[PDB]
Amino acid sequence: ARLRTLHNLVIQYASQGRYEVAVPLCKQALEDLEKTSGHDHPDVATMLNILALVYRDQNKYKDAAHLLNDALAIREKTLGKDHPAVAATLNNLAVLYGKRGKYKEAEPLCKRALEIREKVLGKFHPDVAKQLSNLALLCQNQGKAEEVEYYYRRALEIYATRLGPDDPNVAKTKNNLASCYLKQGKYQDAETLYKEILTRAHEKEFGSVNGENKPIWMHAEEREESDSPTVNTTLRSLGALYRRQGKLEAAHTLEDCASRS
């Protein structure tokens, strides 16, 4: 009864921008909880998480991180290891660690979190894919090129199959993975990936390709011889690959189409 409303208020006020107003409400609510239950409790963990999220926005990063470590210490005893809450917390306190530049420190947290997620949900679950996506970035900054490919590649096998083909999440992943291929020197692979993206889009725009209904790239790659942001980035990105391929007319027309958007 007690927590039920304050918990809502801190959030109500923090959202509003009333940070200073929110923090004491939380702070007193904490002391009112610790009177009865002490540090060990799931709501104390929840409230603490709420506090540290205020500290994130404030850019008091090490404090926030420490706070969530404490929260995870409470969450593990209370809820138990290999819990979804524990996983969420490990995911959260890894974003703070990554942002801080502690990329190698965030990696075990994330690796454990993904392993908890897999245990609770399943090997081919969308949240697991989201986690793999998160992990792929922690490995991108580290310069573990192959790891990036493997993780985004695994992410796609859990996304597009479970998801709609026309999904933005799927496109997001296919755009990241194709950049990871650009770095590796897997140029045609990335090129083929970008073509796939464009093809996914052309089809929602107009029915599937026919003789005259052909895609944007096919138009340009043939001219050579004789609205979405994620897909504009693609026009530009493939436009660069044609700059690499010497297929200028293709890069010209792709760039133009991107400009028109």
């Binding site: 998480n49 709420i50 999220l53 959260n92 974003v95 989201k130």
Partner: peptide
């Protein structure tokens, strides 16, 4: 990186 807020919600 993407945040996972289910810890408070």
């Amino acid at each position: 990186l993407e945040w996972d807020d289910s810890t408070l919600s």
